[model samples]
Target: TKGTIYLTFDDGPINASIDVINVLNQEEVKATFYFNAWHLDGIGDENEDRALEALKLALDSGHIVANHSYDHMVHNCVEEFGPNSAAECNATGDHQINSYQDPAYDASMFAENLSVLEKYLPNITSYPNYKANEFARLPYTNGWRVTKDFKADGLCATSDDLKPWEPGYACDTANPSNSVKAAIAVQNILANNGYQTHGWDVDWAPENWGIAMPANSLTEAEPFLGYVDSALNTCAPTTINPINSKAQEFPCGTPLHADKVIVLTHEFLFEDGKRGMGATQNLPKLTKFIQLAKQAGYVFDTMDNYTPNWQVGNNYSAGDYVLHLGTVYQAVTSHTAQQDWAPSPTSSLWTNADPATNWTQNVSYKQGDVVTYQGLRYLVNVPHVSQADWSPSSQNTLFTAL
Candidate 1:
């Protein structure tokens, strides 16, 4: 699997924001922070006045701070995009509503929030300018607005009463989920605004976001880490809504859309003492997660540099990147482009940039040691062997030359 994991936090720059930042710093990894502009004001449940400081801290600490939304939910925009009852819709920038179940949010709504967000962090585009092509996460949906090919809406992330996989759940598979229309529309709206919206394959929450943080307790680091592995292998939700993929509306062959996982969570849960197991337990869980994820070979990155676009027929060097078909891949060695070999997890010609490795001497070897020999990496099928003993010729497996 492509070993890229994007850890994105939402509704943040809150009281515990700085605390989480320190953990990421100690772990020596980068993450993306999606902010709620309303937190800057003393209105939301989060600590006010200190929100700006938290934002500055995140940026200063080398994390990418992106937009979540201004009021956090614009139900008026939601109603315009889809069908909803007054009971379920927010006509006046509703924040007093469900967190996971969001109404459709348009480009204008998302953009306005960023405008106010810029007011708090004027120099957000500092070290690396926050380009429109950078990323944003929808307030409530696991919906995606990645590339056109990989675009999808989390039909269930936002709902008044529908579970994502339930019988009348909303989806834009052009089906019963009336919300799908709004979801897809909002995604397009984000694209029109020069940004992409991301959905999550994994979420770091105390008790998961399903109950919407009902327990307000953080999960132990190791078990949650197991969830990461689970996401990577089984049914990585990277493409369109779950309903769309499950109904067989689309073929699931492409690792192109399924590889890199984006994690979703909120800093509100980390607020010490406000919940079941606050910063004391959650903090250690987070730091341990980062350390464990690093050990598991995940390269932590800000969404800004997550993946590069691949160009067909373009010349690429050994380490150059491209967004070939639908996902990102890097060259194992220099080569000229061709349409036939689009870069993806299945491609043997190129190793995915996320887990691309080089032969290292004195590094301990394992049963399935994938090492480069004679400018080619052996797809091992033999016993554990060290640097000198393992040979590509000794195995029946194939290898790819650089």
Candidate 2:
């Protein structure tokens, strides 16, 4: 079975958002964007007005757009928002604000942000295909809510000792955050009102996460690939605190839950030489990372359909059938599906009655581009990039049928 990687981009619709989307467009891969609608409000010379354009581009490009909060709680935490944890700062104000842990945090605030998004593009509703009309990522925290039964919060997102700004800051699986708990609370507020939240297993962040315009810590793209491989192989999605009573449990249920990883990165990391580029470096690093990830056979997907995208971790009983790469296989023996004991016709564990057809994806096409698939010659009719859904078939019109 193939492992899945969910490319979940947070803090977006900024100038760098366009760069990230360009790479995604070039790669023809889909990702879920955790967007901040307020980024469009003009403040600096960052081409703030084009933020909405970026959002539209992401949506039009077939990427999933989700809510990352209107203000991103810039000052919504204990230190930021004051008046006895009242959490100052207004959405209408010019400053970047956070509503995560403050008293101002509530479903109404969440609703207000979503409303701001709908005013621009009303057609948008929900992330890819999830129940959380609030397909969301809590601002300033690592959290997840796939379903009521399976969900969690990052153990070290926001503690005074572990906060992004603290010296010698580090994750404390035992002690997450008042901010995280507040984010978790607000998540519930939205969830109770029909919102779904998901946190990242790994973040492609700079070593100095809180520093202004910090470059990604990966520095090199190759190590980033190794990070993805590590995440998938280990199934170590959320950090765990063996010292914490609540997190001591291991296995995280099954390999399926652990193998699939969600990548949380910010748009600001790549916009150098233009808007707040730290080290005036990192764009090429990102560009190369995208190329390397594809070369390694990683299938990019949006988070709304993460679990259902592939049945890599299902417990198969005799007579049960599973789908993989568009092929259906029936189980011959009762066995659990993992990376290794995958269902295949040749394998004694399962009988693959129907094998997937041979098809190719990941192509950057030019008007005169030519390629062959399934023993047939094809030529690019339109100068457009191909994607997961736009296969080389007569119906797509991107390629000549014959």
TM-scores of the candidates are 0.65, 0.62
lDDT of 1 by residue, 1-402 (tens): 237788888887687788888888988888888876667754455565688888778877878877776655643333343223322343343322233233343445567676776776677656452432356776666665553234555544444444555586444443434444455566655654446666667667655535543435566789987877777744456442334323222224334434566677777667655354566667788888888887888777777755556767778787555554333455666888787886654465565332213343322234554655556666544443233343355443433232
TM-score of 1: 0.65
Score residue 56 of candidate 2 by CA lDDT.
77
Name model 2 segments beyond 4 Å from true: 43-47, 75-99, 102-104, 125-132, 160-177, 207-213, 216-218, 238-258, 273-281, 309-402
Error of 1 at 313 (Å): 16
Worst lDDT run of 10 residues, candidate 2, spans: 240-249
Local lDDT at 28 for model 2: 78
lDDT of 1: 0.59
